[PDB]
């Protein structure tokens, strides 16, 4: 597995500053890098692809530079909308694996549904649907934030259902699946414990351009008490 670390891990500017923010993988991930912005109480989104690649609809004041195991995110100048916490991920392999990422303070979709309160033991069921594309032609992944915690990868399926893949926290546990006449993906989650708490997003992605994370579903809290 490949780590990323950032640095800062927070930091308050005013409008106006030049804002950089480093990254580094613990191995050499090429420029297969990708940025995500993600507001509170919000799914991540893309920024920028391939290291310095700017998103479609992303505003010119976000760059990103770097290759190997160095990396950097530039907001040129902050604006009062740009208050978020950002991720550095690499997408050279498989899985991602997510951390902490950097809190700055100053068509196609993925739904997600079935979250809710259940009792340690207990079993559930999240749903991903998928809208104006076909979910098979993709990997789906579920990744997880705890209150106050970080982003954690929990489970992927290949596209064509091919593999699955689970975080050792929950392998033996969880179940990542789909059913194609719903164009829809799953996590069934059995044994449930406290720390599975958390808000469930899923996403999709594969290999291809821009080979990252470029759809997030909006997320579905899953309480465990």
Same mark, same amino acid.
């Given at each position: 597995d490949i780590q990323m670390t950032q640095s800062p891990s927070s930091l308050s500017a005013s409008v106006g500053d030049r804002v950089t923010i480093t990254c580094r993988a613990s191995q050499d991930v090429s420029t297969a890098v990708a940025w995500y912005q993600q507001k509170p109480g919000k799914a991540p989104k893309l920024?920028?692809?391939?290291?310095?690649?700017?998103?479609?609809?992303?505003?010119?004041r976000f760059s990103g530079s770097g290759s190997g195991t160095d990396f950097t995110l530039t907001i040129s100048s902050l604006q009062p909308e740009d208050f978020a916490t950002y991720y550095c991920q690499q997408?050279? *392999? *498989?899985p991602p694996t997510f951390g902490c990422g950097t809190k700055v303070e100053i068509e196609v979709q993925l739904v997600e549904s079935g979250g809710g309160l259940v009792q340690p033991g207990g079993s559930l069921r999240l749903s991903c649907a998928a809208s104006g594309?076909?979910?098979?032609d993709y990997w789906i992944h579920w990744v997880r934030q705890a209150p106050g915690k970080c982003l954690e990868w929990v489970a992927g399926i290949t596209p064509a259902g091919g593999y699955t893949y689970y975080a050792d926290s929950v392998k033996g546990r969880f179940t990542i699946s789909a059913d194609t006449s719903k164009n829809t993906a799953y996590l069934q989650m059995?044994?449930?414990?406290?720390? =599975? *708490?958390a808000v469930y997003y899923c996403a999709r992605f594969v290999?291809?351009?821009?080979?990252?994370? =470029?759809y997030w579903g909006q997320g579905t809290l899953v309480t465990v008490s």
């Open positions: 920024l920028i692809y391939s290291a310095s690649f700017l998103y479609s609809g992303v505003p010119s997408h050279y *392999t *498989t594309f076909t979910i098979s059995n044994s449930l414990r406290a720390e =599975d *708490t290999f291809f351009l821009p080979y990252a994370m =470029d």
